[PDB]
Amino acid sequence: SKPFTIPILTIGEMTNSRFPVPIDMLHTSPTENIVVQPQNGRCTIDGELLGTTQLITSNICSFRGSISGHEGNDDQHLWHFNITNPNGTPFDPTEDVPAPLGTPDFRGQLYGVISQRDREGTPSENNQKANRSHQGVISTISPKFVPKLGSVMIGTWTTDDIKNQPSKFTPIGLNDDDNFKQWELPNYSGALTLNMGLAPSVFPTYPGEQILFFRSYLPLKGGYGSPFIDCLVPQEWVAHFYQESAPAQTDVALIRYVNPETGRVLFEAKLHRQGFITVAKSGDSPINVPANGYFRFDSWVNQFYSLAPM
Amino acid sequence: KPFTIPILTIGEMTNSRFPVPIDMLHTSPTENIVVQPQNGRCTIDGELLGTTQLITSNICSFRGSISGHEGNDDQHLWHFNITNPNGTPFDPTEDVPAPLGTPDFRGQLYGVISQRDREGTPSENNQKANRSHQGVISTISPKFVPKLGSVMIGTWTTDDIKNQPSKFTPIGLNDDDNFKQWELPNYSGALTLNMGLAPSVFPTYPGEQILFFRSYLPLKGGYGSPFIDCLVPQEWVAHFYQESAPAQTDVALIRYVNPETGRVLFEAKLHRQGFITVAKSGDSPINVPANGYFRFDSWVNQFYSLAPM
Ligand SMILES: [Cl-]
Ligand SMILES: [Cl-]
Ligand SMILES: [Cl-]
């Protein structure tokens, strides 16, 4: 059987699988009263992509397609954004997926830039294509956020310079974090319709364990705070497992966090086949590890393995 | 154990010179240009060169703090002190051209500057204030001196910028005609030569051209379809860096394969320095499947005669 392996990249060499930014830190805390069911950054350790997970970091929380019309009443200009697969073909809602791959998996106000390049050249400019880019916000809580049905709504404040043309949304952060709920899924089909094709929720089963997350802070357009988003594995682990597809000889890999300079093991954890990590820790306190550290696969165990306290 | 290349498709990889997906393969004659990019430079045995770092989202990004302002008619320019990507002060005596990820082209880099203030606000439960706005970083300005620790960012008529910690996230370009992807900026400004460079690359074998991975870039406005060509995808940089596989010879023979049909489509040389050549003359459509990827075949040398692509 092909040996299972984990990337040796450091935290400072990897990206969050739920938002296209570097990982800032490891994080663990109790999650008994939250449902942990993210849809980006979901890959089994034997290489099966789940949820809305795709391979390209820059496509996480990005949309592409075209603007078809203005809806903008009071407050701001609003635009109807027909979205397509990341490769440009029409999204098929009968696929067993929640929404087009990379769609955001949280409730909040996604801030970024919409860029357009027109589909036909301009005859008075030697047939070159016209372009425009402006800031925009995509509310993932709007009743018009229906990515599974092929469209979302984007607002551009007082900017009216948006055409009915091919468009891409590149995420930057959040408009505000007033109601940012990273563990609450949006309605991918809007009001009164349940989500489908979901990666399952994850939780520790063994007494005394918590999930270990990879955390990144997010920029804000305005207001106050230091919002953050937690992923189950880095995006580079998704791409590694997807390519390697090593057989999972049991459903739990024992992994150790190591300092390659000193050669010493710092702590150990369980990497569950479903694609998430648990550790033996109670509470939320500083995780004192070196910047050069990374996880190494040690051996195949099971869900009843008793980890050393982290 | 042996030498491997990622099996990711073009549609699963990112440009190593700008944080966007790869759109297509490209080859054309380059005898009259100097191909010396500084991002996306990694030897096949894992040595990072130039300004190359590992994270796609840090390519063409800067972080640091704003420290000053200059008016320009009704427009605003800001002094942006930059640090290493990990936040520590950049040491210009290091044998690198500039902080890792600094742009490697002359152009008007368009993106968004985001700030989060250093100290909290008591009236907001000691939370930090934030703001983000569009900006342009000219890589041709005399004030573009990243090797010396700073660049200048313009925000048009927006004056809502503080002397606070800041990050610039790139989106694309402000114009097409002044974007020269093969002309390096002056990392130390006027009258000072660049240092720590990854070397220029070129085909030595008669009849060969460099094969590039091309992406189109967004524009803030105006006309055009600008593009940027990298030598290998960013995911190849990360693969070679981790694997650090010994280069048995200085040239790997690689074949582009369709995994569904199992058939080889064309072959190429992957040079140890970190670039690909093909036997082709001219620039014409490269007709390959979207599912295709390169596979290492064998170790050869610079005199291997490739089949015509
Ligand atoms: Cl054009
Ligand atoms: Cl379990
Ligand atoms: Cl804060």
Author numbering:
A (entry chain A): 224 to 533
B (entry chain B): 225 to 533
What does the literature reporting this entry say, word for word?
Noroviruses are highly contagious, infecting both humans and animals. The human norovirus capsid protruding (P) domain binds histo-blood group antigen (HBGA) co-factors for infection, and a recently discovered bat norovirus (GX) was also found to interact with HBGAs. In this study, we determined the P domain structures of four human noroviruses and one bat norovirus using X-ray crystallography to examine structural features linked to potential interspecies transmission. The principal structural difference was a variable length P2 subdomain loop (Loop A), which was located near the HBGA pocket.
The P domains of GII.9 (AY038599), GII.23 (KT290889), GII.27 (MG495077), GVIII (AJ844470), and GX (MF373609) were expressed in E.coli. The five P domains were structurally equivalent with a root mean square deviation for C-alpha atoms ranging between 0.586 Å (GII.23-GII.27) and 1.645 Å (GII.9-GX). The cross-reactivity of the P domains was determined using direct ELISA with a broad-spectrum human norovirus Nanobody (Fc-NB26) that binds to a highly conserved region on the P domain. Fc-NB26 bound to GII.9, GII.23, and GII. P domains in a dose-dependent manner at concentrations less than 80 ng/mL. Structural modeling of the Fc-NB26-binding site indicated that GII.9, GII.23, and GII. P domains contained most of the equivalent residues that could interact with Fc-NB26. Our cumulative data show that Fc-NB26/NB26 binds most GII genotypes, and the epitope is vulnerable and a therapeutic target region for GII noroviruses.
